[PDB]
Design an enzyme around this catalytic site. Structure first.
Site, PDB file in Angstrom:
ATOM      1  N   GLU A  24       0.853  -1.226   0.000  1.00 52.08           N
ATOM      2  CA  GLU A  24       0.000   0.000   0.000  1.00 52.08           C
ATOM      3  C   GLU A  24       0.865   1.242   0.000  1.00 52.08           C
ATOM      4  OE1 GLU A  24      -2.979   0.314   3.008  1.00 52.08           O
ATOM      5  OE2 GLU A  24      -3.828   2.127   2.130  1.00 52.08           O
ATOM      6  N   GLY A  36       2.825   2.352  11.177  1.00 53.24           N
ATOM      7  CA  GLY A  36       2.538   1.462  12.299  1.00 53.24           C
ATOM      8  C   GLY A  36       2.213   0.019  11.922  1.00 53.24           C
ATOM      9  N   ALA A  37       1.401  -0.192  10.887  1.00 54.70           N
ATOM     10  CA  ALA A  37       1.090  -1.566  10.457  1.00 54.70           C
ATOM     11  C   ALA A  37       0.339  -1.473   9.166  1.00 54.70           C
ATOM     12  CB  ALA A  37       0.237  -2.347  11.537  1.00 54.70           C
ATOM     13  N   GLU A  52      -2.755  -3.792   6.749  1.00 54.86           N
ATOM     14  CA  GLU A  52      -3.790  -4.812   6.818  1.00 54.86           C
ATOM     15  C   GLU A  52      -3.833  -5.860   5.696  1.00 54.86           C
ATOM     16  OE1 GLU A  52      -4.141  -1.482   6.014  1.00 54.86           O
ATOM     17  OE2 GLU A  52      -5.850  -1.314   4.569  1.00 54.86           O
ATOM     18  N   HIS A  81      -7.211  -1.690  14.768  1.00 57.97           N
ATOM     19  CA  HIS A  81      -7.348  -1.000  13.484  1.00 57.97           C
ATOM     20  C   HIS A  81      -7.136  -1.997  12.322  1.00 57.97           C
ATOM     21  CE1 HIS A  81      -6.853   2.630  10.878  1.00 57.97           C
ATOM     22  NE2 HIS A  81      -6.234   1.742  10.108  1.00 57.97           N
ATOM     23  N   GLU A  82      -6.031  -2.758  12.328  1.00 56.42           N
ATOM     24  CA  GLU A  82      -5.779  -3.610  11.156  1.00 56.42           C
ATOM     25  C   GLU A  82      -6.835  -4.720  11.103  1.00 56.42           C
ATOM     26  OE1 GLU A  82      -3.908  -2.240   9.216  1.00 56.42           O
ATOM     27  OE2 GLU A  82      -2.651  -1.049  10.526  1.00 56.42           O
ATOM     28  N   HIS A 117     -10.077  -3.458   9.554  1.00 56.49           N
ATOM     29  CA  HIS A 117     -10.016  -3.332   8.091  1.00 56.49           C
ATOM     30  C   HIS A 117     -10.492  -4.566   7.368  1.00 56.49           C
ATOM     31  CE1 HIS A 117      -8.249   0.483   6.856  1.00 56.49           C
ATOM     32  NE2 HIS A 117      -7.117   0.297   7.536  1.00 56.49           N
ATOM     33  N   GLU A 141     -10.105   4.480   5.782  1.00 59.78           N
ATOM     34  CA  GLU A 141      -9.313   4.884   6.948  1.00 59.78           C
ATOM     35  C   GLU A 141     -10.157   5.593   8.006  1.00 59.78           C
ATOM     36  OE1 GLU A 141      -6.715   3.543   7.640  1.00 59.78           O
ATOM     37  OE2 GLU A 141      -6.080   2.833   5.724  1.00 59.78           O
TER      38      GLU A 141
HETATM   39  C1  LIG Z   1      -3.298   5.098  12.502  1.00 57.02           C
HETATM   40  C2  LIG Z   1      -3.179   3.578  12.400  1.00 57.02           C
HETATM   41  C3  LIG Z   1      -3.576   2.750  13.627  1.00 57.02           C
HETATM   42  C4  LIG Z   1      -2.619   2.793  11.161  1.00 57.02           C
HETATM   43  C5  LIG Z   1      -1.831   3.549  10.071  1.00 57.02           C
HETATM   44  C6  LIG Z   1      -0.547   3.861  10.850  1.00 57.02           C
HETATM   45  O1  LIG Z   1       0.263   2.924  10.950  1.00 57.02           O
HETATM   46  N1  LIG Z   1      -0.243   5.088  11.250  1.00 57.02           N
HETATM   47  C7  LIG Z   1       1.030   5.277  12.012  1.00 57.02           C
HETATM   48  C8  LIG Z   1       0.437   6.020  13.239  1.00 57.02           C
HETATM   49  O2  LIG Z   1      -0.459   7.019  12.938  1.00 57.02           O
HETATM   50  O3  LIG Z   1       0.686   5.697  14.393  1.00 57.02           O
HETATM   51  C9  LIG Z   1       2.183   5.929  11.551  1.00 57.02           C
HETATM   52  C10 LIG Z   1       2.153   6.860  10.554  1.00 57.02           C
HETATM   53  C11 LIG Z   1       3.387   7.455  10.285  1.00 57.02           C
HETATM   54  C12 LIG Z   1       4.558   7.103  10.981  1.00 57.02           C
HETATM   55  C13 LIG Z   1       4.588   6.167  12.002  1.00 57.02           C
HETATM   56  C14 LIG Z   1       3.340   5.617  12.292  1.00 57.02           C
HETATM   57  C15 LIG Z   1      -1.643   2.560   8.977  1.00 57.02           C
HETATM   58  O4  LIG Z   1      -1.056   3.278   7.866  1.00 57.02           O
HETATM   59  C16 LIG Z   1      -2.982   2.054   8.447  1.00 57.02           C
HETATM   60  O5  LIG Z   1      -3.962   2.771   8.116  1.00 57.02           O
HETATM   61  N2  LIG Z   1      -3.044   0.729   8.490  1.00 57.02           N
HETATM   62  O6  LIG Z   1      -4.286   0.248   7.989  1.00 57.02           O
HETATM   63 ZN   LIG Z   2      -5.802   1.835   8.081  1.00 60.25          ZN
END
Ligand SMILES: CC(C)C[C@@H](C(=O)N[C@H](C(=O)O)c1ccccc1)[C@H](O)C(=O)NO
Ligand SMILES: [Zn+2]
Ligand SMILES: [Mg+2]
Ligand SMILES: [Mg+2]
Ligand SMILES: [Mg+2]
Ligand SMILES: [Mg+2]
EC number: 3.4.11.-
Length: 889
Positions: free
Chosen positions: A124, A265-266, A268, A301-302, A305, A324
């Site tokens: 993604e 962060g992760a 899906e 969250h994941e 999804h 999102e």
């Molecule tokens: C907000 C979420 C729980 C998941 C989202 C995510 O990982 N965001 C991170 C966060 O906001 O903590 C992140 C962004 C930039 C730098 C480090 C970490 C991921 O992109 C997604 O939508 N997964 O489906």
């Molecule tokens: Zn997401």
């Protein structure tokens, strides 16, 4: 630079029905063979066949097993593979290719890459084209049959989407595994993982179908003991989607995998969710408390999804907020139910009104469904996620739980297994609205403006009470400032959750009421109101707006003490602080401007300080809420209210206000710090890996907040408490002891002690780095240089780089040093990082987002660094787009 426009969406002239992949991982390269079973769509007009493919080394390409000739029949420019139309078949055909890619040197962490000793993909939004040729857009749904082969000793665990249908030995110490995933999916949900992974596992039985689901959570061997809380979170997530939404998991297995190098962060990927280690791994010994809510959030969250993103998918990337915003809203409902603390909702609001409101009043302001983009990576924003989540939550507030659940199930039943747009969601909610209003003419057409209109609305109030009539009126106005996206702003459908508090006894005077403001202004009248009330406005933060409550500080204090709604109490406290901050800021600014030898400062309201004491001393009150009331509003919240913000003058303003309040309450703070110890630091369940107590963690947050206030204040002999705190078994406590010791000669002694405690756990060391970075030290520039030379060095790990630099950028006095040296330092890091990871380089731009809100000297200094970055000859497309937008160029 190509601009994509939302209004230009058109289905492809091609169809990809089946993907058959062979991914052969070798020491110096990875060979990817792919056969695409394709067809011509009804939209075809005889065009060239153009595939996305970025950085691929072509060995060969063929159509129907006939090799294509480069130049005559296809061209490739390292971005697009173009097969000329005269060589494209007019009915079902096979396209095949073999390309070479190099995960070992893929430091951008998109496509297929190596994280330590794990091979992992991240597709993604546009990373599948870095693995093989594709029409890399989410409406190209296909079936996937994937074989991965690798050295068995190095890579004994092989994972991809779907069922593992074969495992086989290969000569020369290799092995392979075949995974068939028959349900259609977009290519961004493809994943593969190879490594020497260790796991924990469990079986979950679904609520209705009683299907056995195997749950696996994976990490490198060193950290596999830290996986237990993630496994519990996944079980909780499954149960909540069952219980609230009536939604069961549909596959035989779900895998979660932690990797050390991850841009966010992760992710899906279907049945194979891949995580930044910092959002999956925790232990009581080696993690700060914040890890526990983070893992709950990110696993949740994941998981959510799987319906909102994977089963109901996106037509195109302009619909991103549909997965999102909706999934963040689902995770917020989940975490609120799991934690049962009011600080969960308050933390989301605190982030929105600081980070997202800043974005929405910056040059980067966009609606949650933008009209155009150049770089897909740049629109994974707090607007799309967090304002989108509030727009998704407003449907629940408008409809109530019963009809919200009805409308959501309508959305799922109608769109399951298909692509969808934001309109499809609004349509489903509208059907519930009609039901709820018992009115088939009711509609939510105006609601769509939440998707299209940028900027934060401002909502303001006037009141009237007629004592003889027992009649109360709330007159409400909304306004959104014009910006570069809409010259004319239209009124929104704003739901205003309200209560009326009797100021004589604190009681509720009306039942649950949500005002539906649909015009630029309206007047809401209430009869049989026996006494003049204090209105409790936007309970639960019911719309993502600037609230101008027009209340006196006496009224706000009564709400803070006696209202039933946590957000309105917290907001009333916020508003009292903001009135004080703006007043003292102006007094300091005038003194500075006029070079005054003496001047006066307006003291903090004494009845407010009394109310803070009243709440702090109440044993029945919530510890987490208490930690908010003793904290001033975030700097990034404050800046939305001040033009040409002089950061030194704001630092002086905050210092005065904290000292005013501490001068009255430090003995109270100290007594609470000591009395909270027994319950806050209770060790009874320290070696129970699954026992997680969010109230207890909030008690530690309050202790650590109070200790910071006492330490800044140089409360007598507080260093004794600091030193004892450094001996706590909880990292939240012993890293706090490093932080607050910044005000004492013991700082570097604690720096060494806590480094030694942190250095042997990858994630704990990152938390130590963050603690050093945000330390309130006069020698912080020298400290950062030491971190660079001694610990960070040339790491390309995003977590390492973000840990060293981002917390420092929130140091109001020092990051914004008037020399511009902080701006220079972060710009150097951004340009350095951009050479290998454009996405993380753009993240590191975050402090520049407020540049045009600062005083004119600091504006000039920030702009100069951004223009210097913009002139770098090797600048990435992502960083260039972002800085061109941010600088209004
Ligand atoms: C907000 C979420 C729980 C998941 C989202 C995510 O990982 N965001 C991170 C966060 O906001 O903590 C992140 C962004 C930039 C730098 C480090 C970490 C991921 O992109 C997604 O939508 N997964 O489906
Ligand atoms: Zn997401
Ligand atoms: Mg390449
Ligand atoms: Mg259950
Ligand atoms: Mg490392
Ligand atoms: Mg502009």
């Amino acid at each position: 630079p190509k601009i994509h426009y939302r209004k230009d969406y058109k289905p492809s002239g091609f169809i990809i029905n089946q993907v058959t992949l062979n991914i052969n991982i070798h020491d110096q390269e990875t060979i990817v063979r792919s056969v695409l079973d394709m067809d011509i769509s009804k939209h075809n007009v005889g065009e060239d066949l153009v595939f996305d493919g970025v950085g691929l080394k072509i060995n060969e390409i063929s159509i129907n097993n006939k090799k294509l000739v480069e130049g005559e029949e296809y061209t490739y420019d390292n971005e697009f593979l173009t097969i000329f139309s005269k060589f494209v078949p007019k009915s079902k055909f096979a396209f095949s290719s073999e390309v070479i890619i190099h995960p070992e040197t893929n430091y951008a962490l998109t496509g297929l890459y190596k994280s330590k000793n794990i091979i992992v993909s991240q597709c993604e939004a546009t990373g599948f084209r870095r693995i093989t040729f594709f029409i890399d857009r989410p409406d190209m749904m296909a079936k996937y049959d994937v074989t991965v082969t690798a050295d068995k000793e190095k890579y004994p665990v092989l994972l991809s989407n779907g069922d593992k249908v074969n495992e086989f030995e290969i000569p020369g110490g290799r092995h392979g595994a075949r995974f068939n995933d028959p349900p259609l999916k977009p290519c961004y949900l493809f994943a593969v993982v190879a490594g020497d992974l260790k796991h924990l596992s469990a079986t979950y039985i679904t609520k209705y179908t009683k299907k056995k689901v195997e749950l696996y959570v994976f990490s490198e061997e060193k950290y596999v003991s830290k996986l237990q809380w993630a496994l519990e979170c996944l079980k909780k997530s499954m149960a909540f989607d069952e219980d609230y939404f009536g939604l069961e998991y549909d596959l035989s297995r779900l895998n979660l995998v932690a990797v050390s190098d991850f841009n966010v962060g992760a992710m899906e990927n279907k049945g194979l969710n891949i995580f930044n280690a910092n959002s999956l791994l925790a232990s009581k010994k080696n993690s700060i408390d914040f890890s526990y809510a983070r893992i709950l959030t990110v696993v949740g969250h994941e998981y959510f999804h799987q319906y909102t993103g994977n089963r109901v998918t996106l037509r195109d990337w302009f619909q991103l907020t549909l997965k999102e915003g909706l999934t963040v809203h689902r995770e917020n409902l989940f975490s609120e139910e799991m934690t049962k603390t009011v600080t969960t909702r308050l933390s989301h609001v605190d982030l929105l009104r600081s980070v997202q409101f800043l974005e929405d009043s910056s040059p980067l302001s966009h609606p949650i469904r933008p009209e155009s983009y150049v770089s897909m990576e740049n629109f994974y924003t707090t607007t799309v996620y967090d304002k989108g989540s509030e727009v998704m939550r407003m449907y629940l507030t408008i409809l109530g739980e019963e009809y919200y659940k009805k409308g959501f199930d309508i959305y799922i039943k109608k769109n399951d297994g298909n692509t969808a747009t934001c309109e499809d969601f609004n349509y489903a909610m509208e059907q519930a609205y009609k039901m709820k209003k018992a009115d088939n003419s009711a509609n939510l057409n105006q609601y769509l403006l939440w998707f299209s209109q940028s900027g934060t609305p401002h909502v303001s109030f006037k009141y009237n009470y007629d004592a003889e009539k027992k009649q109360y009126s709330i007159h409400v106005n909304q306004y959104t400032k014009p910006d570069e996206n809409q010259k004319e702003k239209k009124p929104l459908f704003i739901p205003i959750s309200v209560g009326l508090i009797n100021p004589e006894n604190g009681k509720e005077m009306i039942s649950q009421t949500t005002l539906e403001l649909t015009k630029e202004s309206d007047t809401f009248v209430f009869n049989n109101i026996a006494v003049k009330p204090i209105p409790s406005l936007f309970r639960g933060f019911s719309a993502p707006v600037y609230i101008e409550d027009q209340l006196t500080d006496e009224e706000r204090i009564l709400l803070l003490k006696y209202d039933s709604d946590a957000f309105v109490r917290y907001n009333s406290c916020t508003n009292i602080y903001m009135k004080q901050i703006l007043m003292n800021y102006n007094e300091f600014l005038k003194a500075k401007n006029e070079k005054l030898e003496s001047f006066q400062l307006t003291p903090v309201n004494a009845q407010f300080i009394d109310a803070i004491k009243y709440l702090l001393e109440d044993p029945h009150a919530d510890a987490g809420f208490k930690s908010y009331i003793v904290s001033l509003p975030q700097d990034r919240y404050i800046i939305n209210f001040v033009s040409n913000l002089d950061t030194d003058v704001l630092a002086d303003t905050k210092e005065y206000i904290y000292k005013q309040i501490g001068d009255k309450l430090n003995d109270v703070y100290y007594k609470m710090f000591k009395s909270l110890e027994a319950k806050a630091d209770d060790l009874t369940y320290f070696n129970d890996e699954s026992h997680v107590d969010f109230d207890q963690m909030n008690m530690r947050t309050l202790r650590n907040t109070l200790l910071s206030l006492l330490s800044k204040a140089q409360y007598p002999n507080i260093l004794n408490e600091i030193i004892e705190h450094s001996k706590s078994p909880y990292p939240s406590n012993w890293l706090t002891s490093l932080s607050v010791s910044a005000y004492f000669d013991k700082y570097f002694e604690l720096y060494d002690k806590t480094y030694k405690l942190s250095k042997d756990d990858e994630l704990l060391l990152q938390e130590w780095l963050k603690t050093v970075s945000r330390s309130d030290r006069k020698d912080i520039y020298e400290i950062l240089k030491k971190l660079e030379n001694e610990v960070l060095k040339d790491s390309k790990n995003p977590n390492d780089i973000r840990a060293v630099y981002l917390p420092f950028t929130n140091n109001l006095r020092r990051f914004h040093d008037i020399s511009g040296k902080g701006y220079k330092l972060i710009a150097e890091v951004i340009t350095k990082t951009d050479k290998f990871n454009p996405m993380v380089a753009t993240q590191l731009c975050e402090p520049f987002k407020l540049w045009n809100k600062l005083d004119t000297k600091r504006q000039e200094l920030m702009l100069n660094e951004m223009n210097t970055m913009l002139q770098e000859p090797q600048i990435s497309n992502n960083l260039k787009e972002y800085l061109l937008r941010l600088t209004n160029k």
